[PDB]
Design a protein around this motif. Structure first.
Motif, PDB file in Angstrom:
ATOM      1  N   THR A  16      33.517  13.232 -14.723  1.00  0.00           N
ATOM      2  CA  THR A  16      32.384  12.806 -13.908  1.00  0.00           C
ATOM      3  C   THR A  16      32.020  13.920 -12.934  1.00  0.00           C
ATOM      4  O   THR A  16      30.867  14.165 -12.641  1.00  0.00           O
ATOM      5  CB  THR A  16      32.742  11.549 -13.109  1.00  0.00           C
ATOM      6  OG1 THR A  16      34.003  11.732 -12.483  1.00  0.00           O
ATOM      7  CG2 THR A  16      32.795  10.335 -14.039  1.00  0.00           C
ATOM      8  N   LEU A  74      22.541  -4.473 -14.386  1.00  0.00           N
ATOM      9  CA  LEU A  74      23.758  -3.822 -14.833  1.00  0.00           C
ATOM     10  C   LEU A  74      24.138  -4.398 -16.200  1.00  0.00           C
ATOM     11  O   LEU A  74      24.400  -3.681 -17.145  1.00  0.00           O
ATOM     12  CB  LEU A  74      24.887  -4.048 -13.825  1.00  0.00           C
ATOM     13  CG  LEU A  74      24.399  -3.703 -12.414  1.00  0.00           C
ATOM     14  CD1 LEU A  74      25.520  -3.983 -11.409  1.00  0.00           C
ATOM     15  CD2 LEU A  74      24.006  -2.221 -12.345  1.00  0.00           C
ATOM     16  N   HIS A  77      22.345  -3.090 -19.273  1.00  0.00           N
ATOM     17  CA  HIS A  77      22.887  -1.843 -19.806  1.00  0.00           C
ATOM     18  C   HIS A  77      24.330  -2.048 -20.264  1.00  0.00           C
ATOM     19  O   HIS A  77      24.814  -1.372 -21.151  1.00  0.00           O
ATOM     20  CB  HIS A  77      22.846  -0.738 -18.753  1.00  0.00           C
ATOM     21  CG  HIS A  77      23.409   0.519 -19.354  1.00  0.00           C
ATOM     22  ND1 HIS A  77      22.693   1.290 -20.256  1.00  0.00           N
ATOM     23  CD2 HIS A  77      24.627   1.137 -19.218  1.00  0.00           C
ATOM     24  CE1 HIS A  77      23.481   2.317 -20.627  1.00  0.00           C
ATOM     25  NE2 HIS A  77      24.670   2.272 -20.022  1.00  0.00           N
ATOM     26  N   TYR A 139      31.357   2.169 -17.822  1.00  0.00           N
ATOM     27  CA  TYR A 139      29.951   2.162 -17.421  1.00  0.00           C
ATOM     28  C   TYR A 139      29.836   2.020 -15.903  1.00  0.00           C
ATOM     29  O   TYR A 139      29.259   2.853 -15.235  1.00  0.00           O
ATOM     30  CB  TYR A 139      29.217   1.002 -18.134  1.00  0.00           C
ATOM     31  CG  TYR A 139      27.973   0.572 -17.370  1.00  0.00           C
ATOM     32  CD1 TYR A 139      27.146   1.530 -16.770  1.00  0.00           C
ATOM     33  CD2 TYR A 139      27.658  -0.791 -17.266  1.00  0.00           C
ATOM     34  CE1 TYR A 139      26.003   1.124 -16.067  1.00  0.00           C
ATOM     35  CE2 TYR A 139      26.516  -1.195 -16.563  1.00  0.00           C
ATOM     36  CZ  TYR A 139      25.689  -0.238 -15.964  1.00  0.00           C
ATOM     37  OH  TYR A 139      24.563  -0.635 -15.270  1.00  0.00           O
ATOM     38  N   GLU A 143      29.920   4.729 -12.950  1.00  0.00           N
ATOM     39  CA  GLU A 143      28.736   4.650 -12.097  1.00  0.00           C
ATOM     40  C   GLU A 143      29.125   4.687 -10.618  1.00  0.00           C
ATOM     41  O   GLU A 143      28.638   5.503  -9.860  1.00  0.00           O
ATOM     42  CB  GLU A 143      27.959   3.363 -12.379  1.00  0.00           C
ATOM     43  CG  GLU A 143      26.594   3.434 -11.692  1.00  0.00           C
ATOM     44  CD  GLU A 143      25.783   2.177 -12.009  1.00  0.00           C
ATOM     45  OE1 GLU A 143      26.279   1.093 -11.746  1.00  0.00           O
ATOM     46  OE2 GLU A 143      24.679   2.317 -12.510  1.00  0.00           O
ATOM     47  N   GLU A 146      30.134   7.962  -9.902  1.00  0.00           N
ATOM     48  CA  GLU A 146      29.067   8.935 -10.034  1.00  0.00           C
ATOM     49  C   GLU A 146      28.220   8.978  -8.757  1.00  0.00           C
ATOM     50  O   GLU A 146      27.897  10.034  -8.252  1.00  0.00           O
ATOM     51  CB  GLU A 146      28.202   8.573 -11.243  1.00  0.00           C
ATOM     52  CG  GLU A 146      26.928   9.412 -11.243  1.00  0.00           C
ATOM     53  CD  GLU A 146      26.276   9.384 -12.626  1.00  0.00           C
ATOM     54  OE1 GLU A 146      26.604   8.495 -13.397  1.00  0.00           O
ATOM     55  OE2 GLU A 146      25.464  10.253 -12.894  1.00  0.00           O
ATOM     56  N   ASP A 172      24.086  -0.759  -2.547  1.00  0.00           N
ATOM     57  CA  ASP A 172      23.446  -1.483  -3.638  1.00  0.00           C
ATOM     58  C   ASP A 172      23.675  -2.993  -3.481  1.00  0.00           C
ATOM     59  O   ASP A 172      24.676  -3.529  -3.913  1.00  0.00           O
ATOM     60  CB  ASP A 172      24.018  -1.009  -4.974  1.00  0.00           C
ATOM     61  CG  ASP A 172      23.476   0.379  -5.315  1.00  0.00           C
ATOM     62  OD1 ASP A 172      23.592   1.259  -4.479  1.00  0.00           O
ATOM     63  OD2 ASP A 172      22.951   0.538  -6.406  1.00  0.00           O
TER      64      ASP A 172
ATOM     65  N   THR B  39      19.346   2.883 -19.387  1.00  0.00           N
ATOM     66  CA  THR B  39      20.383   3.758 -19.936  1.00  0.00           C
ATOM     67  C   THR B  39      21.337   4.222 -18.832  1.00  0.00           C
ATOM     68  O   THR B  39      20.959   4.363 -17.686  1.00  0.00           O
ATOM     69  CB  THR B  39      19.734   4.979 -20.591  1.00  0.00           C
ATOM     70  OG1 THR B  39      18.821   5.573 -19.677  1.00  0.00           O
ATOM     71  CG2 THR B  39      18.987   4.554 -21.856  1.00  0.00           C
ATOM     72  N   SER B  40      22.594   4.467 -19.192  1.00  0.00           N
ATOM     73  CA  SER B  40      23.567   4.915 -18.210  1.00  0.00           C
ATOM     74  C   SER B  40      24.878   5.314 -18.899  1.00  0.00           C
ATOM     75  O   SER B  40      24.882   5.831 -19.999  1.00  0.00           O
ATOM     76  CB  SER B  40      23.831   3.806 -17.186  1.00  0.00           C
ATOM     77  OG  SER B  40      24.236   4.410 -15.972  1.00  0.00           O
ATOM     78  N   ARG B  43      25.229   9.651 -17.183  1.00  0.00           N
ATOM     79  CA  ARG B  43      24.754  10.474 -16.079  1.00  0.00           C
ATOM     80  C   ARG B  43      23.775   9.686 -15.206  1.00  0.00           C
ATOM     81  O   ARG B  43      22.590   9.958 -15.180  1.00  0.00           O
ATOM     82  CB  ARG B  43      24.065  11.730 -16.616  1.00  0.00           C
ATOM     83  CG  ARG B  43      23.776  12.689 -15.458  1.00  0.00           C
ATOM     84  CD  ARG B  43      23.174  13.984 -16.004  1.00  0.00           C
ATOM     85  NE  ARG B  43      22.100  13.684 -16.944  1.00  0.00           N
ATOM     86  CZ  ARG B  43      21.518  14.668 -17.622  1.00  0.00           C
ATOM     87  NH1 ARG B  43      21.905  15.902 -17.445  1.00  0.00           N
ATOM     88  NH2 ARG B  43      20.558  14.402 -18.465  1.00  0.00           N
ATOM     89  N   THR B  44      24.282   8.696 -14.483  1.00  0.00           N
ATOM     90  CA  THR B  44      23.413   7.900 -13.626  1.00  0.00           C
ATOM     91  C   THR B  44      22.828   8.769 -12.509  1.00  0.00           C
ATOM     92  O   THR B  44      23.188   9.918 -12.348  1.00  0.00           O
ATOM     93  CB  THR B  44      24.205   6.734 -13.019  1.00  0.00           C
ATOM     94  OG1 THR B  44      24.798   5.979 -14.066  1.00  0.00           O
ATOM     95  CG2 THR B  44      23.274   5.824 -12.198  1.00  0.00           C
ATOM     96  N   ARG B  45      21.912   8.205 -11.726  1.00  0.00           N
ATOM     97  CA  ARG B  45      21.299   8.959 -10.631  1.00  0.00           C
ATOM     98  C   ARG B  45      21.081   8.047  -9.424  1.00  0.00           C
ATOM     99  O   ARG B  45      20.780   6.877  -9.564  1.00  0.00           O
ATOM    100  CB  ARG B  45      19.956   9.538 -11.083  1.00  0.00           C
ATOM    101  CG  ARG B  45      19.405  10.464  -9.997  1.00  0.00           C
ATOM    102  CD  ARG B  45      18.150  11.168 -10.512  1.00  0.00           C
ATOM    103  NE  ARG B  45      17.588  12.024  -9.475  1.00  0.00           N
ATOM    104  CZ  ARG B  45      16.440  12.659  -9.687  1.00  0.00           C
ATOM    105  NH1 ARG B  45      15.816  12.515 -10.824  1.00  0.00           N
ATOM    106  NH2 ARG B  45      15.935  13.425  -8.757  1.00  0.00           N
TER     107      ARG B  45
END
Lengths: 192, 62
Positions: A16, A74, A77, A139, A143, A146, A172, B39-40, B43-45
Motif C-alpha cells: 500500500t 462500500l 464495491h 478492500y 482502504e 490507504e 467518513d 472501483t477500489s 488505489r483508492t483516493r
C-alpha cells in the motif's frame, strides 16, 4: 496480541505504501476492525444461516450480510470485487494455490479457519465464502490504510497513529457509523 | 520460525479439507453490475486533509 494479521498486513503495508511502519495500535484498530468487520459479516451470515438452516455459508449469505452490514456504497464495491474474485479465482480451478488464486494474499486458510472454529456449525465454507471475506477485508483494510497511509505520510509521519484514523474513521461518517470500534487513542473529537 | 512460509499455501487445504461444497464453479459469477462504476481495492483516493476542517466540511457537506 499473539500474531494478528501482522505479517500479511506487513505485506499490504509495504505494498500500500513503502513508508508505513504503522503504529502498533493503528495495527490494533485496523486489526480490531478487520477482526470486527470479519465478525459483523460472518456473524450475520452465520446468523441468517443458523436460522435459515442453510448452514452452507455461501457468497449469498455473506453478500446479504455485507449488504446489510456495510452502509451500501462500500458494499456495492465489496460485492463487485467479491464477485469478480470468485470468477478469476474459480476461472482456473482450486488446482494451483488458493493463497494465490483467490488473487488475495490475505489469510485464506487462517480466516477459513475463523469460519470453521468460530462457526463450527457444519460450515463447509464453499469457495463461495472464504474468498468473499478475504476480498472485503483487503478492500476496506487496504482502504482505511490507504487514506491514512498516503495521508499520514503526506501529513507529517510515515508511522501513522490512531489520530490519522480519527479522521479516516470519524471523518467518513459512513465508516464511522460502521467502525465505531475503539479509536481510544486518537479519537480526540469529544472530550478535550 | 518460518522456513517456507510465503503464503503458506499448505493451509487452505488442511483446514478446508472439510471438502467444501465444491460448487466453487457456481460460486456466483453474476451479481456483477456495479463493477463498471464503483472501483477500489487497488488505489483508492481521498487523502482527507485532517486539521479536522475536513472532518466537518465532510461530516456536514461531504
Amino acid at each position: 496480541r499473539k500474531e494478528t494479521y501482522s505479517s500479511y498486513i506487513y505485506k499490504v503495508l509495504k505494498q500500500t505504501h513503502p513508508d508505513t511502519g504503522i503504529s502498533q495500535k493503528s495495527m490494533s484498530i485496523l486489526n480490531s476492525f478487520v477482526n470486527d468487520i470479519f465478525e459483523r459479516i460472518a456473524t450475520e451470515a452465520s446468523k441468517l444461516a443458523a436460522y435459515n438452516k442453510k448452514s452452507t455459508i455461501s457468497a449469498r449469505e455473506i453478500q446479504t450480510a455485507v449488504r446489510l452490514i456495510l452502509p451500501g456504497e462500500l458494499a456495492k464495491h465489496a460485492v463487485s470485487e467479491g464477485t469478480r474474485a470468485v470468477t478469476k479465482y474459480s476461472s482456473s480451478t482450486q488446482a494451483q494455490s488458493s493463497s494465490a488464486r483467490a488473487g488475495l494474499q490475505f489469510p485464506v486458510g487462517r480466516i477459513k479457519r475463523y469460519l470453521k472454529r468460530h462457526a463450527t456449525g457444519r460450515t463447509r465454507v464453499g469457495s463461495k465464502a472464504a474468498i468473499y471475506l478475504t476480498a472485503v477485508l483487503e478492500y476496506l483494510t487496504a482502504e482505511v490504510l490507504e487514506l491514512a497511509g498516503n495521508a499520514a505520510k503526506d501529513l507529517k509521519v510515515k508511522r501513522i497513529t490512531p489520530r490519522h484514523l480519527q479522521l479516516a474513521i470519524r471523518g467518513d461518517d459512513e465508516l464511522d457509523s460502521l467502525i465505531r470500534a475503539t479509536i481510544a487513542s486518537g479519537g480526540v473529537l469529544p472530550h478535550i | 520460525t518460518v522456513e517456507d512460509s510465503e503464503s503458506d499455501m499448505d493451509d487452505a487445504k488442511l483446514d478446508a479439507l472439510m471438502g467444501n461444497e465444491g460448487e466453487e464453479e457456481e460460486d456466483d459469477l453474476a451479481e456483477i453490475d456495479t463493477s463498471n462504476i464503483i472501483t477500489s481495492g487497488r488505489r483508492t483516493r481521498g487523502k482527507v486533509i485532517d486539521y479536522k476542517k475536513t472532518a466537518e466540511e465532510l461530516d456536514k457537506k461531504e
